[PDB]
Amino acid sequence: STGSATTTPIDSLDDAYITPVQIGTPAQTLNLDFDTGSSDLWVFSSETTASEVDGQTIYTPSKSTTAKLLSGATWSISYGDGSSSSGDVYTDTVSVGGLTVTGQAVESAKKVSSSFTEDSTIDGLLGLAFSTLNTVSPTQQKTFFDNAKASLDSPVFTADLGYHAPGTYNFGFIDTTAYTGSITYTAVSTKQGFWEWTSTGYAVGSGTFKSTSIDGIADTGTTLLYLPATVVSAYWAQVSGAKSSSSVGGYVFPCSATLPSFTFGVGSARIVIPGDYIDFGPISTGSSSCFGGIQSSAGIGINIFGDVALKAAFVVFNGATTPTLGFASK
């Protein structure tokens, strides 16, 4: 089996991407944030505190003939941006782009933090990291991908995120029309539950490539590219007037600037992030100070190849017994 679904930016900055997901019988379609950096599929629901729902589409288990309470199970998660959610658990039928899993754990939110309430376009998250990070207790649950894996033509999914445009998540096959050149595959460590890999270096604009190992995670659920302070400093030093602002919470640059590209290494291959991808617009409406898409990971504790990096590539998440990551230009 295979699945294929379109994923759409939630706003003009590509702050996140939503993909339609069918849950239950009859289908209830919710727009979820596919997150390769976490492993819970959770939704706004009929059980979510009413004051904490503002515009989202909710899952109502009582209206699904295939929904069953997973008795005793609870979940609670906190994300790297400080947001959180928690609740109880149902199993139900979940389909993505024609691909159906029966008995999928659907985590129903009783509580969500304000960040989630305030984002009307996101009805929940669909985790695609490794199932060892799943927060369901006392019985940990598998991700959608893990459940689908054995039925898939090939045990892979791919992320093809668009720049200010729709893109695609595919399950179970690699679309050879979707990228240019070859896919370069690189080793993954699952030791921390993430799609964790080591980039072989970087270049700023038309500068020479610096060979240096950068351990990081491929995370579709993070907006920006977070790299070591040395690297990020070398990048922003090439932008006139750029500076790190503690008041704003990272590097800003004059909106009149033209940004250089950023290149990262995948083995002997290179992925180029166009400078435009690194522009996240005025820090506040009408401001002439713009927020940078490359930021320091110092104090996160991990480097994150978020959407800024991933949307410059066709990315294969290979969940074979020995998992790997593949990157191609597109």
From Swiss-Prot:
S-S bonds: 255-290
Membrane-spanning intervals of the chain: none
UniProt GO molecular function: aspartic-type endopeptidase activity
Chemical reaction(s) catalysed: Hydrolysis of proteins with specificity similar to that of pepsin A, prefers hydrophobic residues at P1 and P1', but does not cleave 14-Ala-|-Leu-15 in the B chain of insulin or Z-Glu-Tyr. Clots milk
Keywords assigned: Aspartyl protease, Disulfide bond, Hydrolase, Protease, Signal, Zymogen
Catalytic residues (positions): 35, 199
Assigned EC number: 3.4.23.22
Enzyme class at the top of the EC tree: hydrolase
Domain Peptidase A1, residue spans: 17-328
Listed GO biological process terms: proteolysis
Family note: Belongs to the peptidase A1 family.
Name by which UniProt lists this protein: Endothiapepsin
Lineage, broadest ranks: Eukaryota, Fungi, Dikarya, Ascomycota, Pezizomycotina
Residues included from the entire protein: 90 to 419 of 419
